[PDB]
Design a binder for this molecule. Sequence first.
Ligand code: NDP
Ligand code: NDP
Ligand code: K
Ligand code: K
Ligand code: ZN
Ligand code: ZN
Lengths: 332, 332
Amino acid sequence: IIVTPRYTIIEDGAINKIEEILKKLNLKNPLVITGKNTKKYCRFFYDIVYYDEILNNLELKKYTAYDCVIGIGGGRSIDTGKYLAYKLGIPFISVPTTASNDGIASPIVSIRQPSFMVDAPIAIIADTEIIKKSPRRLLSAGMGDIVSNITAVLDWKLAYKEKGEKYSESSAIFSKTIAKELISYVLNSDLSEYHNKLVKALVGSGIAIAIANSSRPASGSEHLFSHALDKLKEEYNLNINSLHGEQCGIGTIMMSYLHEKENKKLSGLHEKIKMSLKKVDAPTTAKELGFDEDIIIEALTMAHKIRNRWTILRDGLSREEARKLAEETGVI
Amino acid sequence: IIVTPRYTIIEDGAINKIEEILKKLNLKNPLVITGKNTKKYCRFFYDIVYYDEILNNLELKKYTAYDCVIGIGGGRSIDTGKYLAYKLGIPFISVPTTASNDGIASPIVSIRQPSFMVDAPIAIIADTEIIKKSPRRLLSAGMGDIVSNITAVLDWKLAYKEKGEKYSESSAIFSKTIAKELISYVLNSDLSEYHNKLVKALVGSGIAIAIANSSRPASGSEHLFSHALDKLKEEYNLNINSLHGEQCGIGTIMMSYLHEKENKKLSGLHEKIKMSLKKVDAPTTAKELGFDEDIIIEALTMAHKIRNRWTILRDGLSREEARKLAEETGVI
Ligand SMILES: NC(=O)C1=CN([C@@H]2O[C@H](COP(=O)(O)OP(=O)(O)OC[C@H]3O[C@@H](n4cnc5c(N)ncnc54)[C@H](OP(=O)(O)O)[C@@H]3O)[C@@H](O)[C@H]2O)C=CC1
Ligand SMILES: NC(=O)C1=CN([C@@H]2O[C@H](COP(=O)(O)OP(=O)(O)OC[C@H]3O[C@@H](n4cnc5c(N)ncnc54)[C@H](OP(=O)(O)O)[C@@H]3O)[C@@H](O)[C@H]2O)C=CC1
Ligand SMILES: [K+]
Ligand SMILES: [K+]
Ligand SMILES: [Zn+2]
Ligand SMILES: [Zn+2]
């Protein structure tokens, strides 16, 4: 069984179409989940809750009256609403106020690792006028999440070839081509439609996940690396507000380089990815990202263990190989 | 808006999931539309109506009570139910009993030309046990409807290039790769999962249409050719039981060859397509299809006029060109 969105809207002023969509879906009493910084975009009568409240106290019969959940804001607002909808057995509507990650339209819940699959949101309502004005850092981070499809798909193919893992060529090429087109737009344009093209790309990626019934087309080694970084932040109680997308971008730079070494046909791939990220002002080094080199290296060595998913990392990098990789790609 | 299916089920015994799916969609009063040969698969107590009977006297408050339409059967049952759902402003559930064309999951209504866009079905319930047993000719025809994505996409790229028509690389490559995968499966395997792979491909193709908001990834000059054939059958009152997919398959052979003349990198594409069609016993010649060579030639010369859609046919083939084309590809 494949669950996809029913409705997808990407346009200026889309936020005003919430009610139209609810009506189309025969829904009447949403619970809105949002953030403190995004509450200003919530202009309607519906009940509103902040994702903090929910998160501190998951478990509930408190939510009995709602026939759906609307997640408005950033990745965490969305992710939290998605999870909540799942727990309540009701549809989820995704209303991103930025373009920072591919959770927007994905069936993936990433509240706490390990992440799991639920239903894709029933609707995606992406107001590009709001998104255009979101903090630049979040838009830049979104690029990180998109370029990662490239290594995710490379890693998927690899897992197919070397471990006979189940693979779909048509899903993979869809996911990959989304990334390719955005890279090529970023490298050849004035960027005046970047926010638009980025949100379309992120939504496309979520659909790819749904259709493949797997995060494989959107998540591979580069994501393992990012999760490792997250683990280490928590562990060492580091105070670094690096974004998910940013970490994935840097991850992709390095993992694309590993794939390049083994396959001369991909010559210049890692450079092109790095360039695309620089062009939109996403970080490409550990220093810009806020991390000491030892954390990057530790994250690399542990990345293959984060999940049971074969990638170009294979059975793992040594500290020495990790250091080399990170040096050669300019991450440190 | 992009409107896509919500639920997609492709598996043995899927027909028994209708109740479950209706419940998930909070739908409770369907009208079932079916055919005389497929009524036997309607094992439920819903109201049932035959498409032919609805088709003659179309235009209605007879149906005010239903909250959805379920189309069960072949292309025409589905196409009729889809149309009806659209007229009533209610969701359509698609329940194919064969795999004969891409109307299964598409937002296209093709009752009579010109065909138009509506909503994608809200659910696709494809029982591969039923479909496996459908008349072999219909399964063979389905291949015709799949390979046509290749020329459709070639024609789309050409319209982008030459007329600046709106184009999506990621949708196009998805649609095209679906066809490639299935061709490759057909040429490499024992065909024991062909029905299953075919249904998945046809559904994928419908999703591609939805996502592109256009029939472009799935319908080009080859489909024009097929419509022209249909026009001529009606006009000369020919009694030829040729299927839509069959006609598209042969169309594809010829249109590929036109693309080949201008782009040598594609050379041999049309022969591979021909081979794939032969491997599943779809017709590849006018004689197998049931037509006289003059009808083929006339259809070719009129195809570009069937709709306002720029293709490799451009402003049209002369009868002499048409004959050469059909001769050079072995169609006549
Ligand atoms: N594999 C993974 O880990 C994935 C995880 N996710 C989920 O996404 C999260 C990351 O999301 P991300 O967006 O990167 O980070 P956050 O959701 O933490 O967002 C960062 C900040 O940006 C703010 N913000 C968002 N939009 C606007 C706007 N228009 N104007 C002003 N501020 C805005 C948010 O405000 P506020 O405080 O109001 O929220 C938040 O404070 C993860 O933690 C996870 O829950 C999603 C995809 C993949
Ligand atoms: N581009 C286009 O123009 C497109 C058009 N269409 C629409 O679809 C139609 C073509 O559909 P297609 O399926 O090729 O042709 P039809 O639906 O006309 O015919 C299929 C025939 O097979 C029978 N049948 C189907 N499944 C079974 C089964 N499991 N067992 C026994 N018999 C079965 C049907 O029965 P029954 O007689 O009971 O119906 C029908 O007689 C077109 O006429 C058009 O309306 C669809 C997609 C694209
Ligand atoms: K991604
Ligand atoms: K097609
Ligand atoms: Zn991600
Ligand atoms: Zn067709």
